[PDB]
Paper text:
The pleiotropic roles of RXRα have made this nuclear receptor an attractive target for drug discovery. Given that PPARγ partners with RXRα to form a “permissive” heterodimer, which can be activated by either RXRα or PPARγ modulator, it is possible that Rut increases the transcriptional activities of both RXRα:RXRα homodimer and PPARγ:RXRα heterodimer by activating RXRα or PPARγ. RXRα-LBD or PPARγ-LBD is reported to exhibit notably conformational changes upon agonist binding, subsequently recruiting its co-activator such as the steroid receptor coinducer-1 (SRC1).
To study whether Rut is able to enhance the interaction between RXRα-LBD or PPARγ-LBD and the co-activator, the binding affinity of RXRα-LBD or PPARγ-LBD against SRC1613–773 containing the LXXLL motifs in the presence of different concentrations of Rut is measured. Here, Rut is determined as a heterodimer-selective agonist. Such a PPARγ:RXRα heterodimeric selectivity for Rut is expected to benefit its potential in drug development. Different from rosiglitazone and pioglitazone, the two members of thiazolidinedione (TZD) PPARγ agonists with anti-hyperglycemic activity, Rut could increase GLUT4 expression via enhancing RXRα-LBD/SRC1 interaction and PPARγ:RXRα heterodimer transcriptional activity through direct binding to RXRα.
Residue numbers in the entry:
A (entry chain B), D (entry chain B): 1 to 10
B (entry chain A), C (entry chain A): 229 to 243, 263 to 458
The structure:
């Protein structure tokens, strides 16, 4: 789930 | 601690019709992540649990938001894209049944009771902190946060609306409707994906991925 | 008025594994009608509304009942037929996923909080008085009865469990789980009907009819 | 829905 992870990272 | 002030802040910080709806959904998914980060203690959960919670909750979270956004409009929904979807347009696109459920079970009921933005935010925070979400590394931690939200929501309801002793329960009892409507909306989304003649953007598409 | 005493009375008055489950379901549908007749004010609703409410609510009502019945058993459910369905048996019959949801989201949670029979009865009465049920001649009347149930349930919870201020909300917040599980159970039932190699008795079959 | 009606009748 790359988009979600990236957005949550910061 | 779970202050309703911080939950309202989060709400205020983020403030073919099927195509327009799907485009709006994708847009709002980005905004949803930012909303969740502003919900106290969410960001301090393991990253994998943040992912699980948002993947489990996104549709209900988005549905609650557009439903409350639409309380001042008759027979329609207000998308965050600025676009209005009329009941007639939804019906004419073959999605009338689920559209009518949103209007009758959510929008009209939010309108009837004058659900405020703090209450909406708290209901959304309860949805977000879903301890039944599969794969959570610490469900008890998520259960604890949900408990804190509904403890705070009730206190808010008792203080702001002491004349309505049943208000807190009335708010919570829209959640089964939200759950069923969310599930049906998801079913439609999977069908639009399957059929292939509705554009689905990348984040929305990612949400339709398997775990 | 909506006395929790009368609601508990109603509960006490009525007190291939897929086949056994479906047989149990049919049996319990008869018992469900008698249960509902014992719920204060239900019998005084128009007959058509009684029909709508039970047709809308039967699966969740039955699911709540067998889930609470199964709290003292590990990794299994107790059918009203006296038959036990083990997790392993459910899994071996291809219905493991939904069975596990029942165990984790309902049974184990009812066990964890020691949900009592009055509380179960009230939750079931709330499910029964579903004002969102389509076709109701007077939804406001059904809304009123639901309000009376959850007013009474909360009072019961505050009196019996004053040490647990969040208990009332905790009870209500099993209802979205019950709704989703009910919907999935129905989906399986429609499939068993479609496939045709599971016996479905007359009352259960009637519930699978269109309105 | 004949069974349900009959059972609710009495
Ligand atoms: C009309 C019903 C159907 C079934 C087609 C349907 C509707 C639907 C509606 C919205 C959605 C996903 C949806 O999936 C669906 O399948 O997220 C969009 C919102 C939350 C509005 O984003 C904004 C702009 O706030 C609203
Ligand atoms: C195992 C899951 C599946 C999906 C096959 C499934 C289970 C299921 C279970 C029960 C039911 C209907 C059901 O429909 C289903 O499709 O009503 C029966 C109860 C309420 C137990 O009656 C008694 C005896 O109390 C319980």
């Amino acid at each position: 789930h790359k988009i979600l992870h990236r957005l949550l990272q910061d | 601690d779970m202050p309703v002030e911080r939950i309202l802040e989060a709400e205020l910080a983020v403030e073919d019709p099927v195509t327009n709806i799907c485009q709006a959904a994708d847009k709002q998914l980005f905004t949803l992540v930012e909303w969740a980060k502003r919900i106290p203690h969410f960001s301090e959960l393991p990253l994998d649990d943040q992912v699980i919670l948002l993947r489990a909750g996104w549709n209900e979270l988005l549905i609650a938001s557009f439903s409350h956004r639409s309380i001042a409009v008759k027979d329609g929904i207000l998308l965050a894209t600025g676009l209005h979807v009329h009941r007639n347009s939804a019906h004419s696109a073959g999605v009338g049944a689920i559209f009518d459920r949103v209007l009758t079970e959510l929008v009209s009921k939010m309108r009837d009771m004058q659900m405020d933005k703090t209450e909406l935010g708290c209901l959304r925070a309860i949805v977000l902190f879903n301890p039944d979400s599969k794969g959570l590394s610490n469900p008890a931690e998520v259960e604890a946060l949900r408990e804190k939200v509904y403890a705070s929501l009730e206190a808010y309801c008792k203080h702001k609306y002491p004349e309505q002793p049943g208000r807190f329960a009335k708010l919570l009892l829209r959640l089964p409707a939200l759950r069923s409507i969310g599930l049906k909306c998801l079913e439609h989304l999977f069908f639009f994906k399957l059929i292939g003649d509705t554009p689905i953007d990348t984040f929305l598409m990612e949400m339709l991925e398997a775990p």
